[PDB]
Amino acid sequence: SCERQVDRVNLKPCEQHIMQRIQQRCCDELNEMENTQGCMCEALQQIMENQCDRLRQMVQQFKRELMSLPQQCNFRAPQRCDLDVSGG
């Protein structure tokens, strides 16, 4: 499942990209496993959950770069994905 394989992959190199643009290590970890443009919504959601959860004008900048993360890793961005959960 998407939530089963999201634990195996170490997304920490991808979380390191915050403020770097505001390397290939993130895409190297992103390929595994069975991420044929699937479960990328869970992976992208996990990055938002780990760093700067919820909505500061800098998480918004981080949101734009996260959406472009699949493009630089030779992947298509998720079609159905909700990065922000207000919870109220």
Epitope: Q37, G38, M67, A77, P78, Q79, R80, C81, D82, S86
Partner: antibody
Framework: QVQLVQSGPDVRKPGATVKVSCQTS????????MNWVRQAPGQGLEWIGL????????AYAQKFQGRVTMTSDTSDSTVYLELSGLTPDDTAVYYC??????????????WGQGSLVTVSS | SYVLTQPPSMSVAPGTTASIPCGAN??????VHWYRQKPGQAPVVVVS??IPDRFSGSKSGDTATLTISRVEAGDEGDYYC???????????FGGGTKVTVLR
């Protein structure tokens, strides 16, 4: 030129199963998810379900769960809708819509011609 | 069970501005798209959430309104508002709004 071509009108007996096809061309298949929308002869649009040709994942509406099955064939770039247990209320024109969007944005840009399936004995 | 409520019908004088409401709970947080369906034809999207046209969308507060500037004879038809719910992974369509141009 994104083209969506559907099957012709079908007449099925009540309680039977109907299969509606949606041929796609002009765009890269398995790159955009596709949805099925049905419209009663005098009523409004009703969303049935969702299919992702790249992954095979199917997202159905709560009402249609257990009665609808969606299949995709990347060899001919087609999306199929299969409704089981046909009731007289199911007679409607069935549309297939191509979805263009990323993350929160999700909308249909290339609707199909529609298939008027009539459930009657 | 995300419900989108739309007026059943609307009559607009020619040359004036039209406003079709679409009311759901906190619809501003969601993305609202409007489709226009001529009778006997597949619906056609008039406004979407990412050249100017007479059709535009505001999406402020609990209700989202579609505005048609300078209503003409060709603007008649049924207009539908649709959003993608996240809490249930469902695509929901609003009720049919039959727009009639006064003559």
């Amino acid at each position: 030129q994104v083209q969506l071509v559907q099957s012709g009108p079908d007449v099925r007996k009540p309680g039977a199963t109907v299969k509606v096809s949606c041929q796609t061309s002009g765009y890269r298949f398995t790159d955009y998810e596709m949805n099925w929308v049905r419209q009663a002869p005098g009523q409004g649009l009703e969303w049935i379900g969702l299919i992702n040709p790249h992954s095979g994942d199917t997202a159905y509406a709560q009402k249609f769960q257990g009665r609808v099955t969606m299949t995709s064939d990347t060899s001919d770039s087609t999306v199929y809708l299969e409704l089981s247990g046909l009731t007289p209320d199911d007679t409607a024109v069935y549309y297939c819509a191509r979805s263009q969007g990323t993350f929160e944005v999700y909308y249909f840009v290339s609707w199909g011609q529609g298939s008027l399936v009539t459930v009657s004995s | 069970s995300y419900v989108l409520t739309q007026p059943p019908s609307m009559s607009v004088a020619p040359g004036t501005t039209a406003s079709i409401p679409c009311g759901a709970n906190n619809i501003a947080k969601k993305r609202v798209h409007w489709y226009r369906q001529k009778p006997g034809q597949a619906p056609v999207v008039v406004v979407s959430d990412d050249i100017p046209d007479r059709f535009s969308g505001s999406k402020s507060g609990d209700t989202a309104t579609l505005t048609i500037s300078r209503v003409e004879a060709g603007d008649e038809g049924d207009y539908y508002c649709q959003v993608w719910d996240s809490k249930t992974d469902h695509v929901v369509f609003g009720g049919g709004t039959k727009v009639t141009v006064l003559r």
